[PDB]
RNA sequence: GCAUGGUUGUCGUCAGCUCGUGUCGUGAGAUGUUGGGUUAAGUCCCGCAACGAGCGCAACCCUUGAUUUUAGUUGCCAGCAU
């Protein structure tokens, strides 16, 4: 229920190039600028109410929801979003197998509270070197790739990506795993494979908050 | 010793040889272990459909180079003379 207004004052109609689109995207096309394709903003407030009222649905029994956004456009945005709406998300590199191989991942991330209480309630160092260097280094990169995805603790119900161009392992090990997706799709995105497309722009930095924040206040709607 | 246990040598103290769970391939198989740097070394980092681990590398062991305590003879001799 966002109003055209909003959309066109962001940048959302924006598209990449003429010489780099999908032919899919076809029917969610607006004119030919210079050198640009355009959004139908019509289409756009009529596709993001289905995605408002079906992203609640999911969390209706206060369920959870997962937040991509690896491109160096939106890594705050749905940090910003999830940690407001109270929920989860990736920022740096989407490590392969995090759903499909969720067993051996989960490992990993015990292993990283596993130093948390070493700091909190155990010594602080067992040796000079080797606990204050190797074992505290580890910390840094663990807790940069997985991060604010440590306290879930099944697999996700629903999915939430920006650029599925970019993030393609999410989709495939999603679709492999069966599992709802929504997403924002550019000019030169493929819609075949997600369920409730979104069609914007996602380079915008303006442009994706508007989006990103108004689906967080779906979620945030019913958890109440 | 072109039938064998053994016991050995040289490549070589070179840095390699693999496994589990995922993923790609109809399939034998592949990825991880490739790419950019760095190191004595798949040592370590960054980047990637991979995330980890085992035997190898390094470490644990011996000897030399500084030092504390302990025990002072058959070793040592400053304080004392002989
Ligand atoms: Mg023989
Ligand atoms: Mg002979
Ligand atoms: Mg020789
Ligand atoms: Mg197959
Ligand atoms: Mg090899
Ligand atoms: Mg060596
Ligand atoms: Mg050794
Ligand atoms: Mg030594
Ligand atoms: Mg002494």
Redesign the pocket.
């Given at each position: 229920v966002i109003s055209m207004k909003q959309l066109l004052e962001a940048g959302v109609h924006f598209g990449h190039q003429t010489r780099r689109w999908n032919p899919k995207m076809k029917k969610y096309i607006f004119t030919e600028r210079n050198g640009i394709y355009i959004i139908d903003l019509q289409k756009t407030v009529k596709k993001v109410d289905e995605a408002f009222n079906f992203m609640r649905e999911v969390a209706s029994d206060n369920g959870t929801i997962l937040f991509v956004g690896?491109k160096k456009q939106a890594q705050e945005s749905v940090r910003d979003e999830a940690i407001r709406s109270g929920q989860y998300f990736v920022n740096?590199?989407?490590?392969?197998?995090t759903?499909?191989?969720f067993?051996?991942?989960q490992?990993?991330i015990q292993?990283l509270k596993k130093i948390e209480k070493m700091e909190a309630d155990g010594t602080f160092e067992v040796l000079p070197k080797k606990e204050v260097v190797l074992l505290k280094?580890?910390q840094?990169?663990?807790e940069?790739?997985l991060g604010g995805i440590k306290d879930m603790k099944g697999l996700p119900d629903a999915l939430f990506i920006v650029d599925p161009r970019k993030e393609?392992?999410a989709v495939?090990?999603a679709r492999?795993?069966h599992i709802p997706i929504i997403g924002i799709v550019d000019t030169n995105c493929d819609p075949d494979e997600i369920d409730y497309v979104i069609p914007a722009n996602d380079d915008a930095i303006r442009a994706v908050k508007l989006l990103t924040a108004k689906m967080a206040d779906a979620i945030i709607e019913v958890n109440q």
């Open positions: 690896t740096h590199r989407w490590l392969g197998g759903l499909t191989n067993e051996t991942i490992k990993r292993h280094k580890e840094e990169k663990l940069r790739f393609r392992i495939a090990e492999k795993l």
